[PDB]
Amino acid sequence: TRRVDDATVAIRSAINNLIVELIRGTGSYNRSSFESSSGLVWTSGPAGEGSYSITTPSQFVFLSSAWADPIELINLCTNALGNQFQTQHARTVVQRQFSEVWKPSPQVTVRFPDSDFKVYRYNAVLDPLVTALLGAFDTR
Amino acid sequence: TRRVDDATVAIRSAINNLIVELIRGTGSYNRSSFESSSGLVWTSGPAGEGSYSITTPSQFVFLSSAWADPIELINLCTNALGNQFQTQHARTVVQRQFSEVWKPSPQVTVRFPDSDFKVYRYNAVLDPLVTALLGAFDTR
Amino acid sequence: TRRVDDATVAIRSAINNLIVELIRGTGSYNRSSFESSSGLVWTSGPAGEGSYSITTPSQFVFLSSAWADPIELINLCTNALGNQFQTQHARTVVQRQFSEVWKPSPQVTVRFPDSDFKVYRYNAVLDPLVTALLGAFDTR
Amino acid sequence: TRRVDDATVAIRSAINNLIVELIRGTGSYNRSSFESSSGLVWTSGPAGEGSYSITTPSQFVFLSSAWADPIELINLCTNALGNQFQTQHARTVVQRQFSEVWKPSPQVTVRFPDSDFKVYRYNAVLDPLVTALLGAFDTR
Amino acid sequence: TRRVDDATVAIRSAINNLIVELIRGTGSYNRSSFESSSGLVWTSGPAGEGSYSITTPSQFVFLSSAWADPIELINLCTNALGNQFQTQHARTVVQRQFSEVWKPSPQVTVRFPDSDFKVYRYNAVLDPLVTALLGAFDTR
Amino acid sequence: TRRVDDATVAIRSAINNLIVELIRGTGSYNRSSFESSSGLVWTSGPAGEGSYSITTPSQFVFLSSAWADPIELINLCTNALGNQFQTQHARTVVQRQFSEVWKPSPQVTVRFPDSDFKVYRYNAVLDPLVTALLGAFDTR
Amino acid sequence: TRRVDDATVAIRSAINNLIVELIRGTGSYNRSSFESSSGLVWTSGPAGEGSYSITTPSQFVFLSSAWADPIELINLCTNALGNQFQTQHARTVVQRQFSEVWKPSPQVTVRFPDSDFKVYRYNAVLDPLVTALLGAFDTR
Amino acid sequence: TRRVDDATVAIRSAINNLIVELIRGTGSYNRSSFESSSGLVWTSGPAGEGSYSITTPSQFVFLSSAWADPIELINLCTNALGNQFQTQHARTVVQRQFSEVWKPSPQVTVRFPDSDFKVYRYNAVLDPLVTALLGAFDTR
Amino acid sequence: TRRVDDATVAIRSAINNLIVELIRGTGSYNRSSFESSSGLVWTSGPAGEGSYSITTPSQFVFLSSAWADPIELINLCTNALGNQFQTQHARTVVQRQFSEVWKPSPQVTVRFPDSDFKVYRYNAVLDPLVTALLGAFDTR
Amino acid sequence: TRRVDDATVAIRSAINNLIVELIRGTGSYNRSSFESSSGLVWTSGPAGEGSYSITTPSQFVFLSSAWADPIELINLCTNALGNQFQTQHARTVVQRQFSEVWKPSPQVTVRFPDSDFKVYRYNAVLDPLVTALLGAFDTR
């Protein structure tokens, strides 16, 4: 009963399904698109600090630990496709890597970065793919 | 008989079902919505202290240990989805994390925080999801 | 023959059935409602002491060790839902916690607390639920 | 052959059937009701002593070791419902507790207490319930 | 059950399917074709530095670690075809070699090399072949 | 190492040391001597009850479980001298018998018996002898 | 190495040393002596309730769980002297009995009993004796 | 090598050394003494809330989790002295009890309780005693 | 050879040596003291963002992950003093807790918090104590 | 022969000796100091590219993979001080982390970053410390 031979196919197909949308750029925001689609308005208070105005609680997801650099994420994918997923060590390490890539960037008193782009963990398209990928590593 | 292969699917689907409602913001209150929906009225007694006026015993649930920070809770979810639920250690640790995230914030002599938001453990929509999630970790 | 996998479902469903009524506040009394529904009349004898007037023996249940703080009880429930009921240690500890939460508050020479609320162990609606819950922990 | 799983149900159902009647107060007497229903008449002989006048031998049951305080008995019940009756140690300890709660209070030269209430072990309604309860603990 | 005799055939056929397209040069770009097909425009800012103008997030794939020298890649293929894929050591080593050949060459502040050619990891035709090849080495 | 051959000698010598003083009657009181030496005064209140007047707390020993019938005690001694103290069963049984012979006879609302005699457990001469005797049975 | 033969002597001598002072009544208080020596003043507020006036924190020991009935305590001693302290079961049971005899009687809103006496756990003479006794049961 | 026989003596002597100072009341503060000795000034801002004014960082210890009810703490001591410290389970449980008794009561937005008293974990006299006591339970 | 009995003493003494200085407040900064002692000057650029002016590279330590809340740190200490350092699990968990308490608060584009205080990991007095403490958990 | 107890001390002392110099900022360069001390001159050729002019071969060390971000390196140190160096897994993981932090930043066709700082692996003062640190992890 080689259940590891079926988990490897699922892991690889999940990585590929995530790469398909990462190539298109879907789920990537800058300051403009973030503040436009999230509804958060930055009030540039005096003098060097400021804050976002929270109007609804559903916006608290945007200020959590749910952002990653696009280049770093696609590099994680390209290096993960070249691992021996027959072993448990690799399925643990790359799962930890895909779970720790999501770090906070926007906060209540920290505006979205000026020129950089960030990938949203809970984007409508990336949420199911990243969830399925993280769940594909869960095998005995 | 790999009963652990079925418990992992249930745990992950429960985390996802909870994330679906956490994204929508359902179950999150501020001072205004808390004091409106709970019926508690804050009497600003002299001078720096005060208290809520308890009219019915059903209001005692609101002043218990049933509140969590939305960002902290969704971060628990995002970090939990990247764990090896095939092992018992993880199913115990993340279960303790989802059971201890609920702390008291409103009390009899402590008014609801002024500007922060809190997630209600016994909200009508969040209660079944959190209960099922906590129960999904209970496997031999 | 995993009889422990069926006991966990019963324990969790009993905790939920009790929480459903604890949320509604049913079974919680203050001084007014206690002395009204129990028939006990407080005679304020001189000078700083007093006593309840016992008219029928059925009132001796009210003066036993059958009262708990609502917040403490619902907190026991919320923390109990996050335990590993697959183990015997937890089924013993939380059972002892649900058995020791009932302490005396009204006595023959001790009037019901002035402003606090208490939950009655032998309330018509709470008695079957608490009994079934305490019995759900009894598994080999 | 788990015969212990059926003895636990019987023990719990017997405790509940006893609690049902203890709540109603049936089987509890004071000085007035005891001396009225038992037929014993206290002759206040000189000077500080006295005695009951025994008219029929059937009254010797009333002066035996068959009395308990109602609060103590119902507290034994409320604490007993939270024991692990899967073990022999508990079935022995709580059985000894239900067998030793019955102490003498009226005697030939000791009148029934002035103001206290006592529960009669051989009351018509409590006798079968207490007997069945004591017998439910008798399992291998 | 010699599953290794079937994995070797798949590995070799994948290597051949990749070599067939590498021979035609498909997926190989220079500065002109890269900046034409990717949409990136190099602004030769003062004085010795410069940058590409990012118009859409889908362009972040081009600036990742997804480029390799054509000669080095075809040499990896020609030397890989002469390995003992019956052993796990070889299937691991050559898989790591095919996973590490992809290095970054264009960046935000690093223009595409002037005269050299590079092979694009996520080219429309080479992406499935390289993915299938990397997946063919994953056998127990 | 026959430590049981030395414990038997000590047990028998302790029984004899107790019998020597029991023969002389030392430590035996009636109503007169009890109420004289203890300081307790019986107030023959109306009508058939009464009580002792407690003047100092040191008198609470007299109203405890520290009285035995002289004939019963000397019979315990005479039957105990004919046991096989080489066995543990006998050393346990007769020790329990010498520990349970002390029962309460005078109480707050129970005057000393009119004509009977009683042996005081904490009499100045009998206390050390009874203590040493009870301690002689404690051997491995 | 019979360390149990030395622990038994210490246990018995500790029980005797405690009995010596219990016989004298030292450490026993009534309402008068309690309110005199503790400094607590009872303010008989309207109408049937009241409270003690706490002037110094050292008085909080008096309102803790540190009181026992004298008769019950001396009965525990007299029955404990007749146990087989060679066994661990007895050394555990009687230790639990000497640890649970101390119950609360005076509280902030509960005045000292009118006519009864109570034994103070932290009396200057009884504290070392009770501590040494409880510690004498601690043997492997 | 019975190292447990020496750890028990240290645990008991540490509990006694702590009880000696708990009896004296040292380390117990009310609102007046807390705000006097800590230097914190409560500014009764409008309307029902307020805060302490932090002048030096050394004051942050007072607002941590370092407060306990005096009665609860001395009750922990009196019940702990009656445990079998020869076993590891007890040394773990009572250590957790002495480590969790310290809860926060004063906070930045929560003034010290009006009339209650609290015991300070880091009081100059109680800190070494509590530290040594917690360390006495640490044995293999 | 119980090397674990010596490591516990070192761990506890290190925790105490750190608590001694945490009580004094040494190593805790606010915005004023941080920007004064570090030399960093905040330039309030337009409009809602800003940055510190880096004059020497030695200032990069202040902007790393080396800050903790004083209350959180001292609470880690008070809860750590109540652990079983005889076990490896505790020495690992509390070491991870003392290693993860240090989080970034000042950054290049994130000014020091306005009113909060933070504890500096590399303070001249706290660095050796925290280092020795972290090293005390390192035992086989 | 616990050779692991001496390797841990050496590892920790090496980490501390490196932190001592990282705090002072020694070994950190910007564009100005790098191009000044290394002798490399950037010729701003047309139009958006350029290059350093290599005058002596000793300058090839500066353009290798020998640069790291100061914050990242000191964070590696602060997180490394909290590891269990008794285990081989940690000594391998943190050694790989200290070996992979050094990445290339200046190249022949890539000028030193405009505003960032970098730490030089082969600085005269940091080279021996980093070498000793990397060598301290090499134990059986």
- Does I contact E via 3+ CB–CB distances below 8 Å? no
Q: Which residue of A has its CA nearest to E131?
A: A81
Tell me if C78 sits within 8 A of C67, measured CB to CB.
no
Q: Are strands I118-120 and I67-68 parallel, antiparallel or unpaired?
A: antiparallel
Q: Count CA atoms closer than 13 A to C51's CA, side-chain side.
A: 9
End-to-end CA distance of chain E: 12
Mutate to test the interface with I, among H138, H139, H140 (most CBs of I within 10 A): H138
Chain E residues with CB inside 8 Å of J42's CB? 48
Measure in Å the smallest separation between the Cα of D134 and chain F Cα atoms. Answer: 25
Q: Where are the beta strands (DSSP E) in chain J?
A: 28-29, 41-43, 51-53, 67-68, 118-120
Edge-first strand order for the sheet with H28-29 is H28-29, H118-120, H67-68
Taking the CB of residue F20, how many other CB atoms lie within 10 A of it? 11
Query: Could you check whether the bond before residue B80 is cis, i.e. omega within 30 degrees of 0?
Result: no
Q: In chain B, where does DSSP find H-type helix?
A: 4-24, 31-37, 70-80, 88-100, 126-136
CA distances from J140 to F94, J89, J134 (A): 67, 12, 14
Q: What does this entry list as its resolution, in Å?
A: 3.0
Distance CA J110, CA J103 (A): 14
Q: Are strands F67-68 and F51-53 parallel, antiparallel or unpaired?
A: unpaired
Chain E residues with CB inside 8 Å of J111's CB? 48-49
Distance CA E18, CA E13 (A): 9
Nearest partner of C109 among C39, C45, C24, C37, judged by Cα: C45
Distance CA C11, CA C9 (A): 6
Rounded-to-10 torsion of CA I43, I44, I46, I50: 70
With CB atoms and an 8 Å threshold, state whether G28 touches F60: yes
Determination technique for this entry = X-ray
Distance CA C93, CA C137 (A): 10
Task: Pull the structure tokens for residue D69.
Answer: 């305080």
SS3 track for chain H: CCCHHHHHHHHHHHHHHHHHHHHHCCCEECHHHHHHHCCCEEECCCCCCCEEECCCHHHHHCCCCCEECHHHHHHHHHHHCCCCCCCHHHHHHHHHHHHHCCECCCCCCCCCCCCCCEEECCCCCHHHHHHHHHHHCCCC
What are the CB-based long-range contacts (under 8 Å, 24+) for D79-84?
Answer: D79/C65, D79/C99, D80/D15, D81/C99, D81/C131, D81/C134, D81/C135, D81/D12, D81/D15, D82/C95, D82/C96, D82/C98, D82/C99, D82/C100, D82/C134, D83/C99, D84/C92, D84/C95, D84/C137, D84/C138
Those chains having 3 or more beta-carbon pairs within 8 angstroms of chain E are A, J
Distance CA E2, CA E7 (A): 9
Bridge partners, residue B42, by sequence = B52
Give kind and range of the element (H or E) at residue A67.
strand A67-68
Residue with tokens 């004498």: G136
Could you tell me if C6 lies within 8 Å of chain D, comparing CB atoms? no
Residue with tokens 């509590």: H130
Query: Could you check whether the bond before residue H10 is cis, i.e. omega within 30 degrees of 0?
Result: no
Could you tell me if F53 lies within 8 Å of chain D, comparing CB atoms? no
CA distances from D70 to A67, C57, H1 (A): 65, 9, 52
Measure in Å the smallest separation between the Cα of A138 and chain E Cα atoms. Answer: 17
What are the CB-based long-range contacts (under 8 Å, 24+) for G107-113?
Answer: G107/G63, G108/G51, G108/G52, G108/G54, G108/G63, G109/C110, G109/G49, G109/G50, G109/G51, G110/C109, G110/C110, G111/C48, G111/C49, G111/G31, G111/G42, G111/G50, G111/G52, G112/G29, G112/G30, G112/G31, G112/G34, G112/G35, G113/G31
Q: Which residue of H has its CA nearest to I76?
A: H65
Taking the CB of residue J20, how many other CB atoms lie within 10 A of it? 13
Bridge partners, residue G103, by sequence = G67
Task: Pull the structure tokens for residue G51.
Answer: 């409270």
H71-85 burial: b if 16+ Cβ within 10 Å, else e: bbbbbbbbebbbbbb
Tell me if B118 sits within 8 A of B103, measured CB to CB.
no
Give rounded-to-5 percent helix, strand, coil for chain G: 50, 10, 40
Angle at H123 between CA H120 and CA H129, to 5 degrees: 100
Instruction: Kindly report the length of chain E.
Output: 140
Task: Pull the structure tokens for residue E92.
Answer: 């691991």
Tell whether the torsion through CA atoms of E30, E31, E36 and E38 is positive or negative.
positive
- Does F contact H via 3+ CB–CB distances below 8 Å? no
Phi, psi dihedral angles at J120 (to 5 degrees): -90, 125
Name the residue among F42, F43, F48 with its Cβ closest to that of D50. F48
Query: Could you check whether the bond before residue I47 is cis, i.e. omega within 30 degrees of 0?
Result: yes
Could you tell me if B86 lies within 8 Å of chain A, comparing CB atoms? yes
Query: Which amino acid does the sequence have at C68?
Result: A
Task: Pull the structure tokens for residue B134.
Answer: 């906590």
Task: Pull the structure tokens for residue C97.
Answer: 């916690």
Name the residue among E42, E48, E51 with its Cβ closest to that of J45. E48
Query: Could you check whether the bond before residue J47 is cis, i.e. omega within 30 degrees of 0?
Result: yes
Distance CA F32, CA I110 (A): 93
Could you tell me which residues come within 8 angstroms of residue B1 by beta carbon, excluding any fewer than 6 positions away? none
Largest CA distance in chain G: 66
Distance CA B70, CA B27 (A): 10
Distance of alpha carbon I22 from the chain centroid: 10
Tell me if F20 sits within 8 A of F44, measured CB to CB.
no
